[PDB]
């Protein structure tokens, strides 16, 4: 009852929910000192939908891991200098590189995390409305580069619902 | 009144306590990636040391900021490839560059953090007993590059207890 096409469709809500909950938890953290992105706060979302729950699961589990990459990603994205015009192709080639040596659920989540960091960086540097562009980078990569089919063979995004709760 | 010599002497317990309590809290982190360093787990400390208090406090209040640099320092130290043979040279170049454009308390604490990260690297690449060498790297640089004097003129290491 799952297909690659269905997984790709579902990915938009998964990613938008991931963005919402990741931003919310980082804005709530105590040390933080991180400027809010209002585009991520006012995302229209249905929290109890299944894809909403998947995005939340992936945002909240092990978030201490992505903290260890914060300063490096500031440096790297400053060197990348993403723009509205160059970001799709950079995203696609970075994602291809990421999965070259294999696909696993953690790398799938890392791709969502990169979408989040890229969206936040580009907003903070003055471009509004870019979240819709990054959302399609993520969906279209998964559709056209094996990831959506990989997820579909494993049951769809619902297979990620409980990752990290043993 | 507080001298640069007293600050230099105090710095050893500050740094050793800083290393112990930083390692303790980092090893408690969810998803921690660095393996445990038994030299820091079993590191003995003086129980009632005011300077021990200072090092503990600096480790604690620096945790949020310091961990955000973890992956970048892994990358950078893999590139530097420090060893026992070149550690003094590179520590001195790095510490000199750190303070070239000015001294401030955050940079003072970052020197401690660098000593910690260098000690971890060297142990994890196979060399035991190096913690005493880095400890002296830190103390000697502070004494001879006016950092101990700077701290002394602001009240000594206990002045750091007012941070945060």
């Amino acid at each position: 009852s799952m297909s690659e096409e269905q997984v790709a469709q579902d990915t938009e809500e998964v990613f938008r929910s991931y963005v919402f909950y990741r931003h919310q938890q980082e804005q709530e953290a105590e040390g933080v000192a991180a400027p809010a992105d209002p585009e991520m706060v006012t995302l229209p979302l249905q929290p109890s939908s299944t894809m909403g729950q998947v995005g939340r699961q992936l945002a909240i589990i092990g978030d201490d891991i992505n903290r260890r990459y914060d300063s490096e990603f500031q440096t790297m994205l400053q060197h990348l200098q993403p723009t509205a015009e160059n970001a799709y192709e950079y995203f696609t080639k970075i994602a291809t590189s990421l999965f070259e040596s294999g696909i696993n659920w953690g790398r799938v989540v890392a791709l969502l995390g990169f979408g989040y960091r890229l969206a936040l960086h580009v907003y903070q540097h003055g471009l509004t409305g870019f979240l819709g562009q990054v959302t399609r980078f993520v969906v279209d990569f998964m559709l056209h580069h094996s990831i959506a089919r990989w997820i579909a063979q494993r049951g769809g995004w619902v297979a990620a619902l409980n990752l990290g709760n043993g | 009144s507080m001298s640069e010599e007293q600050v230099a002497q105090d710095t050893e317990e500050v740094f050793r306590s800083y290393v112990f309590y930083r390692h303790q809290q980092e090893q408690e982190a969810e998803g921690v990636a660095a393996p445990a360093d038994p030299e820091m787990v079993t590191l003995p400390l003086q129980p009632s040391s005011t300077m021990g208090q200072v090092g503990r406090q600096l480790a604690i209040i620096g945790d949020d900021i310091n961990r955000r640099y973890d992956s970048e320092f892994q990358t950078m130290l893999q590139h530097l490839q420090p060893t026992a043979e070149n550690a003094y040279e590179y520590f001195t170049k790095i510490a000199t560059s750190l303070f070239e454009s000015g001294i401030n308390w955050g940079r003072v604490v970052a020197l401690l953090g660098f000593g910690y990260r260098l000690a971890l690297h060297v142990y994890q690449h196979g060399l035991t007993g190096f913690l005493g060498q880095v400890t002296r790297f830190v103390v000697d640089f502070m004494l001879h590059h006016s950092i101990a004097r700077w701290i002394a003129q602001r009240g000594g290491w206990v002045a750091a207890l007012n941070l945060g």
Binding site: - | I61, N104, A110, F114
Partner: peptide, 26 residues
């Protein structure tokens, strides 16, 4: 290439300065 010790010192400085700005007096 920037020498590795220079890159490390630059990021040590950034880290320290972040601490310094966060834990400023009053």
């Amino acid at each position: 290439d920037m020498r590795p010790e220079i890159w490390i010192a630059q990021e040590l400085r950034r880290x320290g300065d972040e601490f310094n700005a966060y834990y400023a007096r009053r």
